[model samples]
Target: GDVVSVADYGAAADSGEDSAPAIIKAVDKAKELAAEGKNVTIAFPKGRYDIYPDKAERRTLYVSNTVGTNSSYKDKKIGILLEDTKNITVDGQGSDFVFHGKMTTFAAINSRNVTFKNFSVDFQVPTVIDLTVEKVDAGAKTATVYVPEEYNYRLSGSNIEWYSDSSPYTGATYWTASNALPYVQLYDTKTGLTVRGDVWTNPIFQNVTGITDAGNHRLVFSYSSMSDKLANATGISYQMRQTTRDHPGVFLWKDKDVTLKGIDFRFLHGFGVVGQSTDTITMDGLHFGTGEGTGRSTAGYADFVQMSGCKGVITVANSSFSNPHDDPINVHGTFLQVVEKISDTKIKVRYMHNETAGFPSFFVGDQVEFMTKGDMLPVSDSVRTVTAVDGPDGQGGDMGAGSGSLTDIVLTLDSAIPSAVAVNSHVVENITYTPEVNIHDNVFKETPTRGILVTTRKKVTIENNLFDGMGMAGIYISNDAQSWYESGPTRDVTIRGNTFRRSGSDAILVEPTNPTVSTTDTVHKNMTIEGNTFYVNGNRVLNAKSVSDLTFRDNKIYRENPQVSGSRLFRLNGCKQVVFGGNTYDVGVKAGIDLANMGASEVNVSDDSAKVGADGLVPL
Candidate 1:
């Protein structure tokens, strides 16, 4: 084994200078040593290292979901580039990597057995503008807000517009224009939860008339709407981000056996750590949101971890996520539409969404399944193995700026395409590249969105986690084809031993957007929700639709407060073989079950038969 220190390469901690150049040199040295069959460690001694984008590596490519629609928007500045490295470990030794300007903190591409541990990442100026509510005047329909010092903004007429080093762009003139919408989210300061389903956040922005600076980091916003809904009323904060999601804290692509351990992401810009086509990834002891002493309310601009087209055991354990604008974890695969049939075994597929286009969606030796475009369900037994891939038109290099021609990927299968797999009427999902996920022992607090989102055809185990004040479902299983083009349906899943507390929505929801539904044809199957504890505040504990073979047994439920809507312990629709037994709940909790468009024989809660009615549950 060999050791390469960044300090030896002229990188000094607490120097307040750009350390990205020195860090890159150290990584290059480590790669050279590892190429000679030596395991190498690039070390950063204990201190705060400042990184700037002046001397950073640049890559012009698209990141799934984060890159927005403008694929031509290139210039991705990277702090550390670990390209084509093998058996290399980046050891930060409990140090902090402080980044300035718009830059990705790390990029591990085409690497194997890479580990990044004992480090923290903090951005000097985050892209999000958080305005905490100080007071509200119901009679005047106005609220006083306190803006944090770390964010950059300006009072534009009656509105406050956020700014970064790069000005926000809008519409098709993504780069050359400056008309971005200020998308805002309101979070309750006490509960740290988002606005519930009964109200919409976008209307709050429309109802606002004036925003006047109150000086000393305070602004008074006046609205035409009811004062009760102003700032979602006093005890709330407004979080605004740039509509573009171009950069991330860390980027992973085509890596093998990667581990990120003991990393504190006190503050991250753009999307958090995003991985694409990476295999065998593990995240352990990660801390999300602003760390202590930072005095910031939010830690991330978007999702903490968003993975696409990945495989081979995705695991996230023992992490703390709090007050993020998006989900903590989201794992899914991409779905490419069949554009044309080149031959019996060759087909042209197109990435339907603007943000998901350039990245490789299929590889040689990958197994794929064809599904109908209308219903987005598998064509029976219509799976094939890819023998060759001919497109992504920007193949040999990064999909550079202005490469709108990189949307198509031509795949050649080992066998003939099924007769039902008609061009322009079907989509292909990579089945072999889907990963089995294990997420456990995590604490999700004050998250404005879901805690975890799982959409894969592989086995998933979610257990022993704590979810507090989730704005939506604590866990969401969303499989759809229209939006984002993310594919896969959960065939086998287990949700157990988790404590769901005060979720504004259901604790667990498995609803697929298939456009049509049939009892015999379900999107997901074989799920068990057992032995979990739910402190219900919303209407339903388990709100599932369009599933088969679901088991809910031996769980406990307690009432948190008065039900916001009609109380029902379970609200199911278009499901089959649903079973519930041995579940205990408080007397204040609803013991009733509501089955919409369901047959009595399909449910197996015979012990509570009288508690179940046709359209709604009977009163206990």
Candidate 2:
């Protein structure tokens, strides 16, 4: 491999200046070497090789690798761009890329076979200790903050963490960033709200004991600062905060063979990673979002990772995904609509890649649903099996034939086409064997919605993970056609060897993506929930709906010891071919099974558990 050194290109690794140009110089050298048909390596040897790679460093490169010394960035932003390139690896060698002074992005764009490993990002920019407590009233929850506009300007989401010399202040909870009681002022009701002015202007914090007139007990309000980034006379600059525009630790688009390992995305106001229309991307040992060092766990944050419209062999292993404002793991499909109604049960649909990238594979016999702009909702319909697909037709064929992967699809259905079907009606393929996705041995915490949300996917596995108090469902599996571009029937799923502890909602929730519309194969099929343990204080440990050929076996369920009767262990609604076997539960009046509207042959519950008989428990 050829080599380009940043140091040789006038890059002073010392902290005084921006090292980006030097790195860019090496990038050009590497690019030149690549033009000679040789794979190249760019090396930044030892000691904080700090760089602020701005627009000037945006030189597109191909066929190279960058090796970092201390492996971090200072201020502005860090963009090791490999656009329109392939076979590049960036070894961070365990560096800390800290983004401060507000909204900053760490971007790697539109490249392939780019592997970045062993880098940590710290967005927990140490708060400026430069403010005083104007007044504190015990009767009023509000304290008069004589804050400096320098750092104390944003008053909405920010709050004070109170404490004194021997006594440190804790906020209400980081809900008021968490269970930080405002930073865990409840983690002391007395000393936490004590008199200040006799305070400290530093971190464990100082609070007002009772209500203080004004004085040294300084109260610190800690919040993550965002910014408006621009290229001005200051070079790459950040101006104050605005609506969070860019928040991903890494954003990938329409690329291939990308791998990221051992990344610590420090609490940015957005997703740790968001990938769209991507191919063959893998992440290992990712620590998505962080909290205030475990002192607070309250308010919900954004998704730690969001991957959508991706295809081909994506793997995520051994990651701690927590504190997400939305789904911790969300795998979604693209939405495309019909251009014209060809015939009864047959329609000419155009593939809308942006609607959803669709998935890895789609074929005849797969279930599909359509939605028009009329009748109901998005004019959603039930599952219709795809019998044949031909031509990018109906637009005078000038609409173009479908790509080998996707095109104008001519779908043959089992029933008569509804008259309400119109042009631009969305066509959503349920699950046509989405690539095998494996999620294992990780801890999921504080998810406001679902721990993992997979729709219209196939060959999926969620195993050996722990879900702790996700605000909604631990796993939401659905095959839905709510829009012209939505996914349909999720199939072949395994949720095994996972432990659910006090999940705030149903531990595992499986339902049709939508219910009002009639989908022929709307039933999610061939799922196995095995060898899992659940400790639920929720609606039900296992809540399933609109499923087929589902097996729930070798699972253990326990409620909070003396559990109530109304809170059941398992709840089944409108499912078929469900086998509940070898499940050990802490049965009670609320325990056992709750079933509705399933025939005896449709359910095969265990002899010890299904006491309500095969007729599917009589509604609790």
Candidate 3:
């Protein structure tokens, strides 16, 4: 474990074309010395040296631990580049210079077990500085970008920037425009570069601006930070244009096991980050922005932050995005679990705020959870207490609460089911459900599939809930025997203080299957449907059939459409002793009430009024 300084082994090379050759010789000598029993180090004094083409070839300096022990070699100065080497450490001490030529078509440093710290790189032409694997044309056969497999690479505290004067190609080879410079293409169709074989941590790119033409045609930037400011003079015009096809600021195309933290990407013309067909990506504390000063019509244009065709546990927390063109986050997958079930394979988004307009907070997949926002709705009305189920002859011990939990259901802006929560003997309090929950302050709107459906239960209360938006019925109830026999009807069932607006069908329906036996097993007895408001925006109000001892009182009904016909404001089918008292109906367009097919001796309509038309309902 000896620290072998590079200064002890080699001196500075002479200036001019031979300077590169001397430096390469010194690096090889240091490696050769390290291969022996002694530890060696190579140091460069501060000066500019012009390296020739032969010394500046790909992987000019190859350093490794031949003895497989702790050996060290460090260098400091400008103009140090590497290609395809391993087990080397270069510490710049915050002072080093390196440059790559136009023909230098790959990452400057390509090695495993390599650590680069506090160094500066200047690409003389458009270049890339990362790992890439692709096919290259070598005469008759195709070759891949040269890098050894199974490499452990680390890039910490480095300052790397690219500089290219090349412009968009405007050559005589193709007639498009004049005076256009050739754009630097990183990944060509002939060579598909892949850069996902290492873990990058806490690398700083301070004052990394200027020298356009840097993006790798399809640059996959993940698990890194661009917190430093881009140079004001150079701007991001050197990067790909937003309008160009297959372009993105950070194109996250099918990347996995990635973590992006504390990154600030600004002044770019395209999306902040386009994550299409990607998985297992977590974006935390990310701040992305752009504006009119960036030489573009708009700041950014991502169709969606985390769009569809993506799967697996994705978490976006404490992140803010301001893309004017698309939704902040859009996820499309099947049965994706969030926050609650981590081991389940699905998309999870929590503690994230979507401030952009014209988009939902989150468009998620199935089994998703928004736990931070208190957005879980009650699923069922089946209340189960921890009653002890005794063994034979009441000799069993007490069973604790049946060892189960309640299922909480919620809805999205657009109609889609996240998960199914069964409502068995549960009582829900202070809950709201609707397409637009911002419509009413106190009323909770239920789902479209027959609000408050109760079966084989008694003393159920459907109170203080609002049924709005476009749907079929408000509530449908059946007896304990699962039949419509209104003999001893579901006892003590109350329907109070609910509002039904623009409902497509009936507000409430209570009926019996057998009309002959008014005294059957389950009858509509001691039931009160009171204090409800129904606004007829599309369809009828109530269509009650075959019931006894039913009371409909103190309700308000209004109609918005006048041309639609045969829609009764209240149509009682076959119910006995049905009292329709103390209700106000705006039958301005149609009949206020219609009763048929049953006994209605106790019916009363004291405050009912109607506007007169040719048919006396309302004039068209």
Candidate 4:
């Protein structure tokens, strides 16, 4: 095993072997033929080895494999350096070697089963391929500022570049009064500090390029493949603001599995990738640029991507985000389910502008589902199920109908409503009234100041709806009585089979004013005033002052104001289990069941309860 050809020892077989004493006598004759254990192949057949530090230099070049057994090193500017090696192989077709250093600390090759295929590393500074930097503060600003306690680290297919050519003193007077110097500046003693800690995983940025400040994250990736004229430059920017201190391009804490492909970002002052308490991440094919074009408002401030306390399953696809200023994709996490193995993780933004305003491609925490085209006002609280297809003039019942009678249509919580259409104004389209699905047959033209506005909702079912053009109070319950001292009422409600027509006030009103000492509070409980059909053209069908387990079964009232006067078809005040079964009152003047009492009433109106007709007496 003895093939050591540096021209078999005479050297200078032509190739800039720079005669530094015949390239140090052919590296001491290839370390005396690898200390005679012989199995070396250090052939430099294709020239040029200018070892100039003004002569006799030995900066670094130590290859060890106890000498040979496929122990190789082939062509192309092999200005080598191999320390503590084992089973090495470095092959480069058609030699073009050049490793000229300038003190940012080097590494064109650092081994361990090292197999670099079709290699090419052209450097001047910051060229650490296969990293092993035990420490290098160089004042250390911020670019993965910590996490060096030693471990089996791995970085593949590297191609890093950080250029400064000259003109770099970005001490920031807005960058030396706008001469704008910045190829790489990640410093963290505070002043304008962008991102400083918390990135524990998710680091795989391919094609790679001049990355800046990746401090406050558990995973930050700026994939590479630009130069379409710098691919708009300025892609990543992050800042958490402890106070005026800026510098945050990537920051993730509580790490999790991460991956990013094809990246090209530029000089962002904030938010390019900010993930907190990380979990399963994959960002594919990204291309972002926010240097601010199109008549520049303030010229652009950058904030293209921002995530918070993630859970898992985050897949951003095809990616092409352009932030004029802010909000391209800012998520906070809470019930995020895109399904289909997380289809299109979240994105459809084309060109969102932001010189001063107009950029909300997605600021989701709960909802923002706009397929394409942009604008504002599309905030959901959950529960959106729309399926309507009945239009041959069949007058599709309940939430559906043609051309104009899906209840006339008016629901406007901003705009765009075409899902299970049911309109009359409190804006109910794309229905999502949870509490076991409360009322949705539509048609209450006006007068809903606070009737069926159940807050802190529970067990609702205002069945078969049709509160005819109400002007106020048709089925009003208590609680929301001015936020009841910050939300605390409206429990267990049920106003069955409704159909109150011409109601201008109180067709069914239960009163209970400003009460908030809650612990055992009961405003309306276990209620079941069933089978309704009130035609109180002007007012009062069943108004109460207080209720608890009140059950008025089988109702059908028709009051039209005979002489007004405290008219009541059932006004039991301080009620307690009152059961007035089988009702049918047509009183045009007054009392049909007004068991009045501000004090406790164990009321029991059932003497076979019968009140019907014109003389206001029993007749039906």
The number of the candidate with the highest TM-score is: 1
Clashing pairs in 1: none
The TM-score of candidate 3 is 0.28
After superposition on all CA atoms, how large is the RMSD of candidate 3? 25.4
Per-prediction TM-score to the true structure, in the order listed? 0.89, 0.66, 0.28, 0.17
Off by over 4 Å in 2: 3-16, 32-78, 100-104, 108-110, 124-247, 291-301, 339-421, 424-426, 429-433, 483-488, 517-521, 561-566, 587-589, 611-620
Which candidate do you rate higher for lDDT, 2 or 4?
A: 2
State how far residue 442 of model 2 sits from its true place (Å). 1.2
lDDT of 1 by residue, 1-620 (tens): 98889999878888887788788788888988999999999889899998877778987756777663364565587798888889999999999988877778888888999999999888776666666678877777777777788766776656666655432222111121121235767776675567733223533355667878888888777777653455345666666566567786688888999999999888777677888888789999999878546557788887889888799999999998988878999999888888889899988888888766666777788899998866667898889998887654222343222223567777789888888788888889999889889999999988878889999878899999999988888888988887768877888899989998878778888877777776677778899998898897536788888788999988987777753355577877788988877887776556677777677688888744325653233234
**lDDT by residue for model 3 (166-196), tens:** 2223211111121112221111112112111
| Candidate 3 Cα misplacement greater than 4 A, ranges | 1-446, 455-458, 480-489, 512-522, 561-564, 587-589, 592-596, 606-620
Cα lDDT, model 2, residue 411: 65
Superposed model 1: Cα runs more than 4 Å off: 68-71, 136-143, 152-181, 196-216, 219-233, 393-404, 562-565, 607-610, 614-620
TM-score of 1: 0.89
Which candidate wins on lDDT? 1
Q: What overall lDDT goes with each candidate model?
A: 0.78, 0.51, 0.33, 0.34
RMSD of 2: 12.2
lDDT of 3 at 19: 43
Clashes of each: 0, 58, 30, 40
